[PDB]
Structure formats: structure tokens, C-alpha cells
Amino acid sequence: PTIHDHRYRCLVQLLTKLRKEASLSQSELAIFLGLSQSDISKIESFERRLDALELFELLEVVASRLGLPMDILLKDTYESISKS
Amino acid sequence: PTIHDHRYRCLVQLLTKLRKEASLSQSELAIFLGLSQSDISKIESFERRLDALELFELLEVVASRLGLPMDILLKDTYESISK
């Protein structure tokens, strides 16, 4: 079943964009999350949910590849979520 | 049909402690996340996954209840996931 929540979908889209900017293929990102490339493809197409731990794991490798501090990445990601 | 991943379990255990530290019942937290109390119970007993969005929403309500900056709760949680 397709995941429909708007805020959730927007968050995954942003994270997908982060992955790409970090020059991470779906296969490469999967390695850091204890997942398969297929699992990542399903997450990015909203067929499977990205869990709370995987969120941190993704931001951690993105932060490392781009040379960005985690506190800023985390805060910005949080703030990207529309509160209204 | 429980989740056995160690680091994931540790994260959720910390979030459960944050919930309690903020004096929120499972129903109260459920309301703020637009979920049911049963949903929260299953998350805390590792029977249902807490998703990426729910993670932020939970921290947000905890921060509000404790009067703490989000930066602090984000740091606490990130720091909890060992390596």
C-alpha cells in the first residue's frame, strides 16, 4: 500500500534530495542503513516507511559526505516540516 | 511480530523515557501525533515502527512540555544512537 501522509512524503522527498546531493546511489545509502538498494527504492517511492533510526543514519552519512555539522542538518530537517 | 534490532530498540527506549519525563501518558502523546493510544503502545513495545516524521513530532511535543530547545532533544537523541 502507498503511504499518503503529506508531511511524511515531503520529508522523504527532502531526504532523497539530500542523498543525491551527497552523491550517494540508492545502493550506497542502503549500506549505511542496514538495507538493500530495493528497500531504499521503496522508501523513496513511498511504498515502505523510513523509520526513526534510519532517519539518523541517513543524515549522518549525508553530513559526512557533504562536510556539514549534524546539529545544523538535524535542525534544518526538523524545520523543513511545515507546522501549518 | 516484534522488532529485534538493538540500536532501534535503544532509540525507542530513550524516546519512551523522554515521554515519561515530559509527564505525557501514551494517550496524550498519541493525540499530539494524530495516532491512537494503541499505536503508541505498540511502538513502545517494539511491535510497530516509529517513522521518521513521528520522530520529529514526538520530540517537538516533549520539548514543549519540558520547555527545552529542540536542539537539545535532537542532540540527546542523535547522541543516543551509539555509532
Side-chain angles (χ1 to χ4, degrees), chain A residues 5 7-8 49-53 55-57 60 70 75 77-78 81 83, chain B residues 5 7-8 11 49-53 55-57 60 70-71 74 77-78 81:
Chain A
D5 179 49
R7 296 208 294 169
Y8 171 84
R49 293 190 172 277
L50 176 71
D51 74 39
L53 176 59
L55 159 65
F56 286 101
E57 288 166 341
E60 178 171 24
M70 271 299 289
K75 189 56 170 300
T77 300
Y78 167 62
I81 303 176
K83 293 186 181 180
Chain B
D5 186 65
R7 299 212 306 158
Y8 173 84
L11 174 62
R49 295 268 173 185
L50 175 75
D51 75 31
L53 174 65
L55 175 290
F56 288 116
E57 291 171 338
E60 173 176 26
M70 268 295 288
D71 283 346
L74 287 167
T77 314
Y78 175 52
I81 57 173

PDB file of all heavy atoms in Angstrom, chain A residues 5 7-8 49-53 55-57 60 70 75 77-78 81 83, chain B residues 5 7-8 11 49-53 55-57 60 70-71 74 77-78 81:
ATOM      1  N   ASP A   5       0.423  10.199   3.817  1.00  0.00           N
ATOM      2  CA  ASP A   5       0.630  11.429   4.592  1.00  0.00           C
ATOM      3  C   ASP A   5       1.531  12.471   3.935  1.00  0.00           C
ATOM      4  O   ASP A   5       2.708  12.218   3.677  1.00  0.00           O
ATOM      5  CB  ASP A   5       1.186  11.142   5.977  1.00  0.00           C
ATOM      6  CG  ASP A   5       1.422  12.419   6.749  1.00  0.00           C
ATOM      7  OD1 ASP A   5       0.486  13.250   6.780  1.00  0.00           O
ATOM      8  OD2 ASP A   5       2.525  12.603   7.295  1.00  0.00           O
ATOM      9  N   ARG A   7       2.984  15.497   4.992  1.00  0.00           N
ATOM     10  CA  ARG A   7       4.198  15.945   5.666  1.00  0.00           C
ATOM     11  C   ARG A   7       5.258  14.852   5.588  1.00  0.00           C
ATOM     12  O   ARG A   7       6.428  15.145   5.373  1.00  0.00           O
ATOM     13  CB  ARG A   7       3.917  16.295   7.131  1.00  0.00           C
ATOM     14  CG  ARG A   7       2.973  17.478   7.303  1.00  0.00           C
ATOM     15  CD  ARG A   7       3.229  18.223   8.596  1.00  0.00           C
ATOM     16  NE  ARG A   7       2.921  17.443   9.791  1.00  0.00           N
ATOM     17  CZ  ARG A   7       3.271  17.811  11.023  1.00  0.00           C
ATOM     18  NH1 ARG A   7       3.956  18.937  11.218  1.00  0.00           N
ATOM     19  NH2 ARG A   7       2.949  17.057  12.060  1.00  0.00           N
ATOM     20  N   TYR A   8       4.838  13.599   5.743  1.00  0.00           N
ATOM     21  CA  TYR A   8       5.773  12.483   5.679  1.00  0.00           C
ATOM     22  C   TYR A   8       6.386  12.410   4.281  1.00  0.00           C
ATOM     23  O   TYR A   8       7.609  12.331   4.135  1.00  0.00           O
ATOM     24  CB  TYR A   8       5.080  11.163   6.041  1.00  0.00           C
ATOM     25  CG  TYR A   8       5.943   9.947   5.775  1.00  0.00           C
ATOM     26  CD1 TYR A   8       6.888   9.518   6.718  1.00  0.00           C
ATOM     27  CD2 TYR A   8       5.902   9.297   4.537  1.00  0.00           C
ATOM     28  CE1 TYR A   8       7.785   8.483   6.426  1.00  0.00           C
ATOM     29  CE2 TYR A   8       6.785   8.258   4.240  1.00  0.00           C
ATOM     30  CZ  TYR A   8       7.730   7.866   5.186  1.00  0.00           C
ATOM     31  OH  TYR A   8       8.658   6.916   4.855  1.00  0.00           O
ATOM     32  N   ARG A  49       7.972   2.509   4.787  1.00  0.00           N
ATOM     33  CA  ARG A  49       8.304   3.627   5.665  1.00  0.00           C
ATOM     34  C   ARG A  49       9.753   3.688   6.130  1.00  0.00           C
ATOM     35  O   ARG A  49      10.368   2.667   6.419  1.00  0.00           O
ATOM     36  CB  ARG A  49       7.366   3.617   6.886  1.00  0.00           C
ATOM     37  CG  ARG A  49       5.914   3.927   6.509  1.00  0.00           C
ATOM     38  CD  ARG A  49       5.008   4.160   7.697  1.00  0.00           C
ATOM     39  NE  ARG A  49       3.679   4.636   7.294  1.00  0.00           N
ATOM     40  CZ  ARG A  49       3.387   5.902   7.017  1.00  0.00           C
ATOM     41  NH1 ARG A  49       4.310   6.833   7.098  1.00  0.00           N
ATOM     42  NH2 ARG A  49       2.167   6.252   6.653  1.00  0.00           N
ATOM     43  N   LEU A  50      10.298   4.901   6.174  1.00  0.00           N
ATOM     44  CA  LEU A  50      11.657   5.122   6.664  1.00  0.00           C
ATOM     45  C   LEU A  50      11.470   5.239   8.179  1.00  0.00           C
ATOM     46  O   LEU A  50      10.684   6.071   8.627  1.00  0.00           O
ATOM     47  CB  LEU A  50      12.193   6.451   6.148  1.00  0.00           C
ATOM     48  CG  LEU A  50      13.583   6.826   6.671  1.00  0.00           C
ATOM     49  CD1 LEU A  50      14.625   5.914   6.030  1.00  0.00           C
ATOM     50  CD2 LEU A  50      13.879   8.292   6.350  1.00  0.00           C
ATOM     51  N   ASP A  51      12.162   4.428   8.974  1.00  0.00           N
ATOM     52  CA  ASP A  51      11.961   4.535  10.427  1.00  0.00           C
ATOM     53  C   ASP A  51      12.841   5.574  11.124  1.00  0.00           C
ATOM     54  O   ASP A  51      13.749   6.163  10.518  1.00  0.00           O
ATOM     55  CB  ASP A  51      12.070   3.149  11.119  1.00  0.00           C
ATOM     56  CG  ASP A  51      13.509   2.615  11.226  1.00  0.00           C
ATOM     57  OD1 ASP A  51      14.445   3.395  11.496  1.00  0.00           O
ATOM     58  OD2 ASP A  51      13.699   1.379  11.091  1.00  0.00           O
ATOM     59  N   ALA A  52      12.555   5.809  12.404  1.00  0.00           N
ATOM     60  CA  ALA A  52      13.269   6.798  13.201  1.00  0.00           C
ATOM     61  C   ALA A  52      14.777   6.602  13.275  1.00  0.00           C
ATOM     62  O   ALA A  52      15.515   7.574  13.292  1.00  0.00           O
ATOM     63  CB  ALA A  52      12.679   6.846  14.614  1.00  0.00           C
ATOM     64  N   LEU A  53      15.243   5.361  13.349  1.00  0.00           N
ATOM     65  CA  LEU A  53      16.689   5.112  13.393  1.00  0.00           C
ATOM     66  C   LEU A  53      17.341   5.393  12.028  1.00  0.00           C
ATOM     67  O   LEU A  53      18.377   6.062  11.944  1.00  0.00           O
ATOM     68  CB  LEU A  53      16.973   3.662  13.814  1.00  0.00           C
ATOM     69  CG  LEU A  53      18.457   3.282  13.800  1.00  0.00           C
ATOM     70  CD1 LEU A  53      19.264   4.202  14.740  1.00  0.00           C
ATOM     71  CD2 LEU A  53      18.593   1.836  14.217  1.00  0.00           C
ATOM     72  N   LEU A  55      16.412   7.395   9.815  1.00  0.00           N
ATOM     73  CA  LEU A  55      16.483   8.839   9.594  1.00  0.00           C
ATOM     74  C   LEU A  55      17.837   9.362  10.085  1.00  0.00           C
ATOM     75  O   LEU A  55      18.531  10.098   9.369  1.00  0.00           O
ATOM     76  CB  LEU A  55      15.354   9.554  10.345  1.00  0.00           C
ATOM     77  CG  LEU A  55      15.547  11.050  10.643  1.00  0.00           C
ATOM     78  CD1 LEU A  55      15.582  11.843   9.380  1.00  0.00           C
ATOM     79  CD2 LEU A  55      14.419  11.531  11.486  1.00  0.00           C
ATOM     80  N   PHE A  56      18.226   8.995  11.305  1.00  0.00           N
ATOM     81  CA  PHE A  56      19.508   9.477  11.822  1.00  0.00           C
ATOM     82  C   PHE A  56      20.681   8.918  11.026  1.00  0.00           C
ATOM     83  O   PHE A  56      21.663   9.619  10.765  1.00  0.00           O
ATOM     84  CB  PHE A  56      19.681   9.118  13.315  1.00  0.00           C
ATOM     85  CG  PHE A  56      18.837   9.951  14.233  1.00  0.00           C
ATOM     86  CD1 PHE A  56      17.652   9.453  14.763  1.00  0.00           C
ATOM     87  CD2 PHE A  56      19.230  11.249  14.563  1.00  0.00           C
ATOM     88  CE1 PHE A  56      16.859  10.234  15.616  1.00  0.00           C
ATOM     89  CE2 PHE A  56      18.453  12.040  15.412  1.00  0.00           C
ATOM     90  CZ  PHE A  56      17.257  11.525  15.941  1.00  0.00           C
ATOM     91  N   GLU A  57      20.596   7.645  10.654  1.00  0.00           N
ATOM     92  CA  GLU A  57      21.677   7.025   9.895  1.00  0.00           C
ATOM     93  C   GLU A  57      21.904   7.705   8.548  1.00  0.00           C
ATOM     94  O   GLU A  57      23.047   7.895   8.108  1.00  0.00           O
ATOM     95  CB  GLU A  57      21.381   5.532   9.714  1.00  0.00           C
ATOM     96  CG  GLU A  57      21.562   4.803  11.033  1.00  0.00           C
ATOM     97  CD  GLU A  57      20.993   3.419  11.042  1.00  0.00           C
ATOM     98  OE1 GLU A  57      20.156   3.101  10.188  1.00  0.00           O
ATOM     99  OE2 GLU A  57      21.385   2.644  11.939  1.00  0.00           O
ATOM    100  N   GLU A  60      23.448  11.163   9.079  1.00  0.00           N
ATOM    101  CA  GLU A  60      24.854  11.008   9.476  1.00  0.00           C
ATOM    102  C   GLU A  60      25.795  10.841   8.270  1.00  0.00           C
ATOM    103  O   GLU A  60      26.829  11.531   8.168  1.00  0.00           O
ATOM    104  CB  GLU A  60      24.985   9.818  10.430  1.00  0.00           C
ATOM    105  CG  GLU A  60      26.386   9.525  10.871  1.00  0.00           C
ATOM    106  CD  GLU A  60      26.433   8.482  11.983  1.00  0.00           C
ATOM    107  OE1 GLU A  60      25.475   7.678  12.091  1.00  0.00           O
ATOM    108  OE2 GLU A  60      27.436   8.474  12.732  1.00  0.00           O
ATOM    109  N   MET A  70      26.173  17.888  12.093  1.00  0.00           N
ATOM    110  CA  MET A  70      24.904  17.214  12.379  1.00  0.00           C
ATOM    111  C   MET A  70      23.864  18.114  13.019  1.00  0.00           C
ATOM    112  O   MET A  70      22.691  18.052  12.665  1.00  0.00           O
ATOM    113  CB  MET A  70      25.115  15.993  13.290  1.00  0.00           C
ATOM    114  CG  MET A  70      25.398  14.690  12.550  1.00  0.00           C
ATOM    115  SD  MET A  70      24.059  14.181  11.434  1.00  0.00           S
ATOM    116  CE  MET A  70      22.821  13.703  12.562  1.00  0.00           C
ATOM    117  N   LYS A  75      18.571  20.196  12.738  1.00  0.00           N
ATOM    118  CA  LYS A  75      17.661  21.313  12.956  1.00  0.00           C
ATOM    119  C   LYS A  75      16.954  21.717  11.672  1.00  0.00           C
ATOM    120  O   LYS A  75      15.730  21.919  11.659  1.00  0.00           O
ATOM    121  CB  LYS A  75      18.416  22.515  13.525  1.00  0.00           C
ATOM    122  CG  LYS A  75      17.481  23.628  13.973  1.00  0.00           C
ATOM    123  CD  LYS A  75      16.464  23.085  14.995  1.00  0.00           C
ATOM    124  CE  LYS A  75      15.664  24.197  15.646  1.00  0.00           C
ATOM    125  NZ  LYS A  75      16.589  25.112  16.358  1.00  0.00           N
ATOM    126  N   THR A  77      16.415  19.924   8.975  1.00  0.00           N
ATOM    127  CA  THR A  77      15.493  18.871   8.562  1.00  0.00           C
ATOM    128  C   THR A  77      14.217  19.012   9.376  1.00  0.00           C
ATOM    129  O   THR A  77      13.111  18.989   8.843  1.00  0.00           O
ATOM    130  CB  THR A  77      16.104  17.465   8.774  1.00  0.00           C
ATOM    131  OG1 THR A  77      17.310  17.335   7.993  1.00  0.00           O
ATOM    132  CG2 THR A  77      15.116  16.401   8.337  1.00  0.00           C
ATOM    133  N   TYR A  78      14.366  19.161  10.684  1.00  0.00           N
ATOM    134  CA  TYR A  78      13.199  19.366  11.535  1.00  0.00           C
ATOM    135  C   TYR A  78      12.396  20.587  11.076  1.00  0.00           C
ATOM    136  O   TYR A  78      11.162  20.517  10.917  1.00  0.00           O
ATOM    137  CB  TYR A  78      13.621  19.604  12.987  1.00  0.00           C
ATOM    138  CG  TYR A  78      12.481  20.119  13.833  1.00  0.00           C
ATOM    139  CD1 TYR A  78      11.335  19.348  14.026  1.00  0.00           C
ATOM    140  CD2 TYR A  78      12.522  21.393  14.391  1.00  0.00           C
ATOM    141  CE1 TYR A  78      10.249  19.835  14.743  1.00  0.00           C
ATOM    142  CE2 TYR A  78      11.442  21.894  15.118  1.00  0.00           C
ATOM    143  CZ  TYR A  78      10.308  21.106  15.285  1.00  0.00           C
ATOM    144  OH  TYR A  78       9.228  21.594  15.977  1.00  0.00           O
ATOM    145  N   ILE A  81       9.775  20.702   8.084  1.00  0.00           N
ATOM    146  CA  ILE A  81       8.428  20.199   8.236  1.00  0.00           C
ATOM    147  C   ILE A  81       7.470  21.355   8.532  1.00  0.00           C
ATOM    148  O   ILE A  81       7.612  22.051   9.536  1.00  0.00           O
ATOM    149  CB  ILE A  81       8.362  19.162   9.368  1.00  0.00           C
ATOM    150  CG1 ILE A  81       9.345  18.020   9.079  1.00  0.00           C
ATOM    151  CG2 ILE A  81       6.945  18.618   9.491  1.00  0.00           C
ATOM    152  CD1 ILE A  81       9.424  17.012  10.179  1.00  0.00           C
ATOM    153  N   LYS A  83       4.596  23.385   9.943  1.00  0.00           N
ATOM    154  CA  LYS A  83       3.843  23.220  11.182  1.00  0.00           C
ATOM    155  C   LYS A  83       2.388  23.582  10.912  1.00  0.00           C
ATOM    156  O   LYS A  83       1.507  23.326  11.735  1.00  0.00           O
ATOM    157  CB  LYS A  83       4.408  24.114  12.287  1.00  0.00           C
ATOM    158  CG  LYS A  83       5.804  23.731  12.757  1.00  0.00           C
ATOM    159  CD  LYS A  83       6.213  24.592  13.947  1.00  0.00           C
ATOM    160  CE  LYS A  83       7.607  24.262  14.450  1.00  0.00           C
ATOM    161  NZ  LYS A  83       7.977  25.119  15.617  1.00  0.00           N
TER     162      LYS A  83
ATOM    163  N   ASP B   5      15.960  -5.357  16.372  1.00  0.00           N
ATOM    164  CA  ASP B   5      17.178  -4.589  16.154  1.00  0.00           C
ATOM    165  C   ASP B   5      17.592  -3.812  17.392  1.00  0.00           C
ATOM    166  O   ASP B   5      16.846  -2.959  17.894  1.00  0.00           O
ATOM    167  CB  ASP B   5      17.032  -3.622  14.992  1.00  0.00           C
ATOM    168  CG  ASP B   5      18.332  -2.927  14.679  1.00  0.00           C
ATOM    169  OD1 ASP B   5      19.287  -3.619  14.257  1.00  0.00           O
ATOM    170  OD2 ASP B   5      18.415  -1.703  14.872  1.00  0.00           O
ATOM    171  N   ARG B   7      19.992  -1.287  18.148  1.00  0.00           N
ATOM    172  CA  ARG B   7      20.090   0.164  18.191  1.00  0.00           C
ATOM    173  C   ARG B   7      18.721   0.838  18.073  1.00  0.00           C
ATOM    174  O   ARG B   7      18.495   1.873  18.687  1.00  0.00           O
ATOM    175  CB  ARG B   7      21.038   0.670  17.096  1.00  0.00           C
ATOM    176  CG  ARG B   7      22.478   0.163  17.222  1.00  0.00           C
ATOM    177  CD  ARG B   7      23.472   1.193  16.703  1.00  0.00           C
ATOM    178  NE  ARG B   7      23.177   1.619  15.337  1.00  0.00           N
ATOM    179  CZ  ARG B   7      23.597   2.762  14.805  1.00  0.00           C
ATOM    180  NH1 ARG B   7      24.325   3.599  15.526  1.00  0.00           N
ATOM    181  NH2 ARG B   7      23.306   3.061  13.546  1.00  0.00           N
ATOM    182  N   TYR B   8      17.818   0.235  17.307  1.00  0.00           N
ATOM    183  CA  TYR B   8      16.468   0.778  17.140  1.00  0.00           C
ATOM    184  C   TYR B   8      15.734   0.699  18.478  1.00  0.00           C
ATOM    185  O   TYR B   8      15.074   1.656  18.903  1.00  0.00           O
ATOM    186  CB  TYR B   8      15.698   0.006  16.049  1.00  0.00           C
ATOM    187  CG  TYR B   8      14.240   0.417  15.952  1.00  0.00           C
ATOM    188  CD1 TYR B   8      13.852   1.535  15.206  1.00  0.00           C
ATOM    189  CD2 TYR B   8      13.265  -0.233  16.714  1.00  0.00           C
ATOM    190  CE1 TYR B   8      12.523   1.997  15.242  1.00  0.00           C
ATOM    191  CE2 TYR B   8      11.950   0.219  16.756  1.00  0.00           C
ATOM    192  CZ  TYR B   8      11.582   1.330  16.030  1.00  0.00           C
ATOM    193  OH  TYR B   8      10.279   1.796  16.128  1.00  0.00           O
ATOM    194  N   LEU B  11      16.909   3.402  20.843  1.00  0.00           N
ATOM    195  CA  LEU B  11      16.371   4.701  20.481  1.00  0.00           C
ATOM    196  C   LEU B  11      14.955   4.858  21.047  1.00  0.00           C
ATOM    197  O   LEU B  11      14.649   5.846  21.729  1.00  0.00           O
ATOM    198  CB  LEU B  11      16.337   4.845  18.950  1.00  0.00           C
ATOM    199  CG  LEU B  11      15.652   6.104  18.415  1.00  0.00           C
ATOM    200  CD1 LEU B  11      16.381   7.324  18.897  1.00  0.00           C
ATOM    201  CD2 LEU B  11      15.624   6.073  16.908  1.00  0.00           C
ATOM    202  N   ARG B  49       6.725   0.129  13.941  1.00  0.00           N
ATOM    203  CA  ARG B  49       7.842   1.054  13.751  1.00  0.00           C
ATOM    204  C   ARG B  49       7.423   2.513  13.969  1.00  0.00           C
ATOM    205  O   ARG B  49       6.304   2.896  13.643  1.00  0.00           O
ATOM    206  CB  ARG B  49       8.382   0.939  12.320  1.00  0.00           C
ATOM    207  CG  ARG B  49       9.004  -0.396  11.953  1.00  0.00           C
ATOM    208  CD  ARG B  49      10.477  -0.398  12.205  1.00  0.00           C
ATOM    209  NE  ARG B  49      11.039  -1.728  12.001  1.00  0.00           N
ATOM    210  CZ  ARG B  49      12.301  -2.057  12.250  1.00  0.00           C
ATOM    211  NH1 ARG B  49      13.163  -1.169  12.706  1.00  0.00           N
ATOM    212  NH2 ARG B  49      12.709  -3.289  12.038  1.00  0.00           N
ATOM    213  N   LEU B  50       8.329   3.308  14.526  1.00  0.00           N
ATOM    214  CA  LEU B  50       8.104   4.736  14.713  1.00  0.00           C
ATOM    215  C   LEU B  50       8.743   5.312  13.455  1.00  0.00           C
ATOM    216  O   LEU B  50       9.931   5.071  13.194  1.00  0.00           O
ATOM    217  CB  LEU B  50       8.848   5.251  15.945  1.00  0.00           C
ATOM    218  CG  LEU B  50       8.784   6.762  16.168  1.00  0.00           C
ATOM    219  CD1 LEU B  50       7.393   7.139  16.695  1.00  0.00           C
ATOM    220  CD2 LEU B  50       9.844   7.180  17.187  1.00  0.00           C
ATOM    221  N   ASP B  51       7.985   6.048  12.652  1.00  0.00           N
ATOM    222  CA  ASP B  51       8.583   6.561  11.432  1.00  0.00           C
ATOM    223  C   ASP B  51       9.336   7.884  11.593  1.00  0.00           C
ATOM    224  O   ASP B  51       9.336   8.499  12.659  1.00  0.00           O
ATOM    225  CB  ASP B  51       7.563   6.608  10.275  1.00  0.00           C
ATOM    226  CG  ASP B  51       6.551   7.740  10.388  1.00  0.00           C
ATOM    227  OD1 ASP B  51       6.871   8.805  10.942  1.00  0.00           O
ATOM    228  OD2 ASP B  51       5.430   7.567   9.861  1.00  0.00           O
ATOM    229  N   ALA B  52      10.040   8.262  10.536  1.00  0.00           N
ATOM    230  CA  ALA B  52      10.863   9.459  10.538  1.00  0.00           C
ATOM    231  C   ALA B  52      10.128  10.725  10.934  1.00  0.00           C
ATOM    232  O   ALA B  52      10.680  11.554  11.658  1.00  0.00           O
ATOM    233  CB  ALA B  52      11.519   9.631   9.160  1.00  0.00           C
ATOM    234  N   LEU B  53       8.897  10.888  10.455  1.00  0.00           N
ATOM    235  CA  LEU B  53       8.116  12.085  10.785  1.00  0.00           C
ATOM    236  C   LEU B  53       7.651  12.049  12.242  1.00  0.00           C
ATOM    237  O   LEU B  53       7.707  13.062  12.944  1.00  0.00           O
ATOM    238  CB  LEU B  53       6.894  12.213   9.855  1.00  0.00           C
ATOM    239  CG  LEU B  53       5.923  13.348  10.206  1.00  0.00           C
ATOM    240  CD1 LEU B  53       6.641  14.684  10.020  1.00  0.00           C
ATOM    241  CD2 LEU B  53       4.671  13.295   9.317  1.00  0.00           C
ATOM    242  N   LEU B  55       9.086  10.741  14.643  1.00  0.00           N
ATOM    243  CA  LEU B  55      10.253  11.020  15.493  1.00  0.00           C
ATOM    244  C   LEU B  55      10.298  12.512  15.808  1.00  0.00           C
ATOM    245  O   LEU B  55      10.360  12.904  16.977  1.00  0.00           O
ATOM    246  CB  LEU B  55      11.541  10.595  14.781  1.00  0.00           C
ATOM    247  CG  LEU B  55      12.950  10.846  15.343  1.00  0.00           C
ATOM    248  CD1 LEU B  55      13.301  12.290  15.314  1.00  0.00           C
ATOM    249  CD2 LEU B  55      13.036  10.328  16.758  1.00  0.00           C
ATOM    250  N   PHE B  56      10.275  13.348  14.774  1.00  0.00           N
ATOM    251  CA  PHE B  56      10.303  14.801  14.987  1.00  0.00           C
ATOM    252  C   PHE B  56       9.099  15.320  15.780  1.00  0.00           C
ATOM    253  O   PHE B  56       9.250  16.155  16.693  1.00  0.00           O
ATOM    254  CB  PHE B  56      10.376  15.551  13.651  1.00  0.00           C
ATOM    255  CG  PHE B  56      11.700  15.447  12.973  1.00  0.00           C
ATOM    256  CD1 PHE B  56      11.811  14.818  11.738  1.00  0.00           C
ATOM    257  CD2 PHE B  56      12.841  15.999  13.554  1.00  0.00           C
ATOM    258  CE1 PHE B  56      13.029  14.736  11.073  1.00  0.00           C
ATOM    259  CE2 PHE B  56      14.083  15.927  12.900  1.00  0.00           C
ATOM    260  CZ  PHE B  56      14.181  15.295  11.654  1.00  0.00           C
ATOM    261  N   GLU B  57       7.909  14.836  15.435  1.00  0.00           N
ATOM    262  CA  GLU B  57       6.689  15.250  16.119  1.00  0.00           C
ATOM    263  C   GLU B  57       6.747  14.949  17.613  1.00  0.00           C
ATOM    264  O   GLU B  57       6.319  15.765  18.441  1.00  0.00           O
ATOM    265  CB  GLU B  57       5.477  14.543  15.490  1.00  0.00           C
ATOM    266  CG  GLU B  57       5.203  15.034  14.075  1.00  0.00           C
ATOM    267  CD  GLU B  57       4.149  14.220  13.330  1.00  0.00           C
ATOM    268  OE1 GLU B  57       3.880  13.050  13.676  1.00  0.00           O
ATOM    269  OE2 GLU B  57       3.602  14.766  12.360  1.00  0.00           O
ATOM    270  N   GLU B  60       9.143  17.250  19.305  1.00  0.00           N
ATOM    271  CA  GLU B  60       8.519  18.562  19.386  1.00  0.00           C
ATOM    272  C   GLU B  60       7.579  18.681  20.593  1.00  0.00           C
ATOM    273  O   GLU B  60       7.624  19.684  21.305  1.00  0.00           O
ATOM    274  CB  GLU B  60       7.749  18.882  18.094  1.00  0.00           C
ATOM    275  CG  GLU B  60       6.926  20.163  18.170  1.00  0.00           C
ATOM    276  CD  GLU B  60       6.247  20.526  16.850  1.00  0.00           C
ATOM    277  OE1 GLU B  60       5.988  19.603  16.037  1.00  0.00           O
ATOM    278  OE2 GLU B  60       5.962  21.736  16.638  1.00  0.00           O
ATOM    279  N   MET B  70      14.605  22.573  20.833  1.00  0.00           N
ATOM    280  CA  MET B  70      14.615  21.346  20.043  1.00  0.00           C
ATOM    281  C   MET B  70      16.055  20.877  19.829  1.00  0.00           C
ATOM    282  O   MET B  70      16.303  19.676  19.764  1.00  0.00           O
ATOM    283  CB  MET B  70      13.931  21.553  18.685  1.00  0.00           C
ATOM    284  CG  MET B  70      12.429  21.218  18.687  1.00  0.00           C
ATOM    285  SD  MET B  70      12.053  19.448  18.980  1.00  0.00           S
ATOM    286  CE  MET B  70      12.563  18.708  17.421  1.00  0.00           C
ATOM    287  N   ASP B  71      16.988  21.820  19.697  1.00  0.00           N
ATOM    288  CA  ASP B  71      18.410  21.484  19.511  1.00  0.00           C
ATOM    289  C   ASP B  71      18.900  20.504  20.587  1.00  0.00           C
ATOM    290  O   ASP B  71      19.722  19.619  20.314  1.00  0.00           O
ATOM    291  CB  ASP B  71      19.287  22.744  19.589  1.00  0.00           C
ATOM    292  CG  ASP B  71      19.233  23.593  18.320  1.00  0.00           C
ATOM    293  OD1 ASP B  71      18.748  23.102  17.273  1.00  0.00           O
ATOM    294  OD2 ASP B  71      19.699  24.754  18.372  1.00  0.00           O
ATOM    295  N   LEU B  74      17.225  17.018  20.036  1.00  0.00           N
ATOM    296  CA  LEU B  74      17.768  16.407  18.832  1.00  0.00           C
ATOM    297  C   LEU B  74      19.138  15.816  19.151  1.00  0.00           C
ATOM    298  O   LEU B  74      19.463  14.692  18.749  1.00  0.00           O
ATOM    299  CB  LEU B  74      17.883  17.453  17.719  1.00  0.00           C
ATOM    300  CG  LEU B  74      16.531  17.868  17.121  1.00  0.00           C
ATOM    301  CD1 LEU B  74      16.693  19.119  16.260  1.00  0.00           C
ATOM    302  CD2 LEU B  74      15.971  16.691  16.307  1.00  0.00           C
ATOM    303  N   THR B  77      18.919  12.664  21.397  1.00  0.00           N
ATOM    304  CA  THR B  77      18.521  11.507  20.617  1.00  0.00           C
ATOM    305  C   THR B  77      19.616  11.044  19.660  1.00  0.00           C
ATOM    306  O   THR B  77      19.895   9.854  19.590  1.00  0.00           O
ATOM    307  CB  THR B  77      17.239  11.832  19.798  1.00  0.00           C
ATOM    308  OG1 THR B  77      16.284  12.488  20.644  1.00  0.00           O
ATOM    309  CG2 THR B  77      16.609  10.568  19.254  1.00  0.00           C
ATOM    310  N   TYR B  78      20.234  11.965  18.929  1.00  0.00           N
ATOM    311  CA  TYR B  78      21.290  11.562  17.998  1.00  0.00           C
ATOM    312  C   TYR B  78      22.439  10.912  18.749  1.00  0.00           C
ATOM    313  O   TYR B  78      22.969   9.879  18.341  1.00  0.00           O
ATOM    314  CB  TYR B  78      21.834  12.758  17.206  1.00  0.00           C
ATOM    315  CG  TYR B  78      23.017  12.365  16.337  1.00  0.00           C
ATOM    316  CD1 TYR B  78      22.919  11.285  15.462  1.00  0.00           C
ATOM    317  CD2 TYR B  78      24.234  13.032  16.425  1.00  0.00           C
ATOM    318  CE1 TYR B  78      23.996  10.872  14.702  1.00  0.00           C
ATOM    319  CE2 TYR B  78      25.337  12.625  15.663  1.00  0.00           C
ATOM    320  CZ  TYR B  78      25.202  11.535  14.805  1.00  0.00           C
ATOM    321  OH  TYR B  78      26.267  11.080  14.061  1.00  0.00           O
ATOM    322  N   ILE B  81      22.136   7.133  19.720  1.00  0.00           N
ATOM    323  CA  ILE B  81      22.459   6.069  18.792  1.00  0.00           C
ATOM    324  C   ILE B  81      23.980   6.026  18.756  1.00  0.00           C
ATOM    325  O   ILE B  81      24.631   6.845  18.107  1.00  0.00           O
ATOM    326  CB  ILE B  81      21.851   6.312  17.394  1.00  0.00           C
ATOM    327  CG1 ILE B  81      22.320   7.649  16.825  1.00  0.00           C
ATOM    328  CG2 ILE B  81      20.335   6.318  17.495  1.00  0.00           C
ATOM    329  CD1 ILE B  81      21.904   7.872  15.389  1.00  0.00           C
TER     330      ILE B  81
END
